[PDB]
């Protein structure tokens, strides 16, 4: 019944039929993105209209199309031809992964490069990497992937241990031409394997770990209704899933007494970018937007009980479309469970004699995705006390190169002859805020140091200052860890019992933002990543910080174009965009498979409640 329900296999089948009948799904068509559209602002009509957005690619070289379809009215709403030289290429297709290796395998320039290195072409894997936009005029308007080669010694070998450096090729995947092959020199292919399941490398496995059993004998404390609506410990929300963004959280609310109070209308990771800091011409073009270019949701793993998710697990199995419009289930793609989280509140009072201890817990909603060498877990946490937290968990295999004789300022050595270029992993969280309703504002809060003197005679005073962001042109903010800078999202029309505006405080990790030179191509295409915090006025079509078509777009789309409208954001329907990321100087311990590292952010209530919201928690 809910307009926020997951897409069903039946809905996907109808979309395919509607497209087919209208002539838009010929044998040369490929669906490059399919996703349900959110209800527009003003759903108080209950006139449910399930609409879907589709990007249609053409393998014969015709112009792609963007198409909106109503499964509720069996109609094509709109269908527009796209000029990709203008607005960007469509996301990479999964079936294009192997096309790069196959086209290179018959190219004479490629075979001469491999032969000079004594490499058997049947052993050489080619990574299908997004191309970006650089100096090559012949690439404008064409669908280009770039290829870097790795050697597999045998079918189960980890190819990442054997990069073929000094060699890169560019490929046009529509016309099937190899446009350039660049060979800058021969590097020894690193010889050690990185097979982390080989007993030769692992040694004897440990026998010292004894099992930890986590069970819920009466089942979990949360309920799931309508397929994806969650209620847990006064929290209410809908769990959505989009093939581009992955897990999306809708309608986050908290039941404060008899009142259901909204907090966040929509929460997602709307983009992520991995820029590499190696100036070698072999890799200096390398940046991928896993979300915008590859679509992280379509590579979600099936999560195994006991290994990936431990405890009393409830699974969701989202449905997406394959390239031909058929539905495919991602079995067990989303794990949901509650976890004990230590002490929530504790006090032993000397004067009253009362000893008080309560335990905390959190609700976990998570998925894992794999794009090539990288694996990422996305975790949303809801805590008893009103805190919301996101955590990214980065693991998988680092992207490798040769380690140059005589070292490098931009590459780490992981093993003899084997290097790992410096890079970042940068995320954009899009938080469509709804603190007690849609009239919200953002204040920047800094600690204020005070000078010893009149009114502060012992020099101990300190304070804080809050600056309201009133227009989009002043809502592009940087972190300042030294002044304890945070941002408060408040509702000036909703007050707590002290007559102060209710609010939530955003706590950032204050990691470095984009390191690239501001005049670089990546700084223009990933402009969102140059600042920690952006606030925009809500608008239906402003979904991604990089725009709708990230692949090979020349830059500027998204956030910098949105905020130039300079709209009013002081007590309006606003969206907060938080940039956060990891700067990764690879270490020896990251090899041959990387232990998880983490980054994220959290939001805590700031005078949202009239007192602690966990006074009614019982004693275990």
* SS3 of residue 67 by DSSP: strand
| The one segment of 29-37, 167-175, 478-486, 562-570 that binds a second copy by CB under 8 A | 478-486
Figure out which of the listed residues 39, 396, 404, 492 binds a second copy, where binding follows CB under 8 A: 396
**Binds a second copy (CB under 8 A): choice among 60, 259, 354, 405:** 354
Q: Select from 546, 573, 563, 352 the least CA-distant residue to 472.
A: 563
Spell out the residues 6+ positions from residue 140 whose beta carbon is closer than 8 angstroms to its own: 85
What residues between 125 and 154 interact with a second copy by CB under 8 A? 125, 134, 152
Structure tokens at 341: 């989280």
Tell me the closest approach of the beta carbon of residue 204 to Cu ion, in angstroms. Answer: 30
Which of 284, 373, 483, 583 is close enough to bind ligand PEA by CB under 6 A? 373
Site membership for ligand PEA, residue 294 (CB under 6 A): yes
Contact pick of 202, 467, 561, 565 for a second copy (by CB under 8 A): 202
Residues 390 and 404 sit within 8 Å (Cβ to Cβ) = no
> What is the spatial order of strands in the sheet that 401-402 belongs to?
401-402, 418-421, 411-415
554 binds a second copy (CB under 8 A): no
The residue count for binding a second copy (CB under 8 A) is 150
Cα distances from 470 to residues 267, 537, 587, in angstroms, run 23, 11, 44
Query: How far apart are CB 423 and Cu ion at their closest, in Å?
Result: 6
Count of positions on this chain that bind Cu ion (CB under 5 A): 1
562 binds a second copy (CB under 8 A): no
| CA-wise closest residue to 516 among 275, 293, 308 | 275
Task: Give the residue numbers annotated as catalytic, written as ranges.
Answer: 290, 374
Q: Which does residue 573 bind out of Na ion, a second copy, ligand PEA, none, counting CB within 5 to 8 angstroms by kind?
A: Na ion
The option from Na ion, Cu ion, ligand PEA, none interacting with 128 (CB < 5 to 8 A, set by class) reads ligand PEA
Task: Based on the shown chain and the rule CB under 6 A, indicate whether residue 272 belongs to the binding site for ligand PEA.
Answer: no
| Cα dihedral 132, 137, 140, 145 in deg (nearest 10) | -40
Q: Least Å distance between CB 241 and Na ion?
A: 21
487, two tokens: 């941002």
Between 359 and 471, whose beta carbon lies closer to Na ion? 471
| Residue the block writes with tokens 């190219």 | 107
Show the tokens assigned to 118.
């004594």
The DSSP element (H or E) to which 70 belongs, if any, is strand 65-70
Q: Taking a C-beta distance cutoff of 8 angstroms, is the pair 71, 8 a contact?
A: no
Residue 502 makes CB contacts below 8 A (sequence gap 6+) with 435, 436, 490, 491, 494, 495, 496, 607, 608
- State the nearest-atom distance from the C-beta of 412 to Cu ion, in Å: 11
Q: How far is the CB of 330 from a second copy (least distance, A)?
A: 13
- For residue 246, give both structure tokens: 């992955």
Cα-Cα end-to-end distance for the chain: 37
- Interface with Cu ion, residue 283, by CB under 5 A: no
Least separation in angstroms between residue 328's CB and ligand PEA is 20
Among residues 210, 405, 540, 541, the one that binds a second copy under rule CB under 8 A: 210
16's tokens: 């395919």
Judged by CB under 5 A, does residue 432 bind Na ion?
yes
Stretch that binds a second copy, among 164-172, 179-187, 196-204, 427-435 (CB under 8 A): 196-204
Considering only residues 520 through 579, tell me which ones interact with Na ion, judged by CB under 5 A. 538, 573
Residue 347 lies near a second copy (rule: CB under 8 A) = yes
């Amino acid at each position: 019944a809910s307009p926020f329900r997951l897409a069903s296999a039946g809905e996907i089948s109808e979309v395919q039929g509607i497209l087919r009948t209208a002539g838009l799904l010929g044998p040369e068509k490929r669906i490059a993105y399919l996703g349900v559209l959110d209800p527009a602002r003003g759903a108080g009509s209950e006139a449910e209209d399930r609409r879907f957005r589709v990007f249609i690619h053409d393998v014969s070289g015709a112009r792609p199309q963007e198409v909106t379809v109503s499964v509720t009215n069996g109609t094509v709403i709109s269908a527009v031809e796209l000029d990709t030289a203008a607005t960007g290429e469509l996301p990479v297709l999964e079936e294009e992964f192997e096309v790069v290796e196959q086209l290179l395998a018959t190219d004479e320039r490629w075979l001469k490069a491999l032969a000079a290195r004594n490499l058997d072409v049947s052993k050489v894997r080619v990574a299908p990497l997004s191309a970006g936009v650089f100096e090559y005029a012949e690439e404008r308007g064409r669908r280009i992937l770039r290829g870097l080669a790795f050697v597999q010694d045998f079918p189960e070998d980890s190819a990442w241990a054997h990069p073929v450096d000094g060699l890169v090729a560019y490929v046009d995947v529509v016309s099937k031409e190899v446009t350039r092959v660049i060979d800058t020199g021969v590097f020894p292919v690193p010889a050690e394997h990185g097979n982390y399941t080989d007993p030769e490398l692992t040694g004897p496995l440990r026998t010292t770990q004894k099992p930890i059993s986590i069970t819920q004998p009466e089942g979990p404390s949360f309920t799931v209704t309508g397929g994806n609506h969650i209620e847990w410990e006064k929290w209410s929300l809908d769990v959505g899933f989009d093939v581009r963004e992955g897990v999306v959280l809708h309608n986050i609310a908290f039941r404060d007494g008899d009142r259901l109070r909204p907090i966040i209308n929509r929460a997602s990771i709307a983009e992520m970018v991995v820029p590499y800091g190696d100036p070698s011409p072999i890799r200096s073009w390398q940046n991928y937007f896993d979300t915008g270019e590859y679509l992280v949701g379509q590579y979600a793993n099936s999560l195994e009980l006991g290994c990936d998710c431990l405890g009393d697990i409830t699974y969701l199995s989202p449905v997406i479309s394959d390239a031909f419009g058929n539905p495919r289930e991602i079995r067990n793609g989303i794990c949901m469970h509650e976890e004990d989280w230590g002490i929530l509140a504790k006090h032993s009072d000397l004067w009253s004699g009362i000893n008080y201890t309560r335990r905390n817990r959190r609700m976990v909603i998570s998925f894992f995705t794999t794009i090539g060498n990288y694996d990422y877990g996305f975790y949303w946490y809801l805590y008893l006390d009103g805190t919301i937290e996101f955590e990214a968990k980065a693991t998988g295999v680092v992207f490798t190169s040769a380690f140059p004789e005589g070292g490098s300022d931009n590459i780490s050595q992981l093993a003899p002859g084997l290097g790992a270029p410096f890079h970042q992993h940068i995320f954009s969280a899009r938080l469509d805020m709804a603190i007690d309703g849609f009239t919200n504002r953002v204040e920047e809060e800094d600690v204020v140091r005070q000078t010893m003197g009149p009114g502060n005679e012992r020099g101990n005073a300190f304070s804080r200052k809050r600056t309201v962001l009133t227009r989009e042109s002043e809502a592009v903010r940087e972190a300042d860890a030294r002044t304890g800078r945070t941002w408060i999202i408040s509702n000036p029309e909703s007050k707590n019992r002290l007559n102060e505006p209710v609010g939530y405080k955003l706590h950032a990790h204050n990691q470095p933002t984009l390191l690239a030179d501001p005049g670089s191509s990546i700084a223009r295409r990933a402009a969102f990543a140059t600042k920690d915090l952006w606030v925009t006025r809500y608008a239906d079509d402003e979904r991604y910080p990089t725009g709708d078509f990230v692949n090979q777009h020349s830059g500027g789309a998204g956030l910098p174009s949105y905020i130039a409208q300079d709209r009013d954001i002081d007590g309006q329907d606003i969206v907060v965009w938080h940039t956060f990321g990891l700067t990764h100087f690879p270490r020896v311990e990251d090899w041959p498979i990387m232990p998880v590292d983490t980054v994220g952010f959290k939001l805590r209530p700031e005078g949202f409640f009239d007192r602690s919201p966990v006074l009614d928690v019982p004693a275990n």
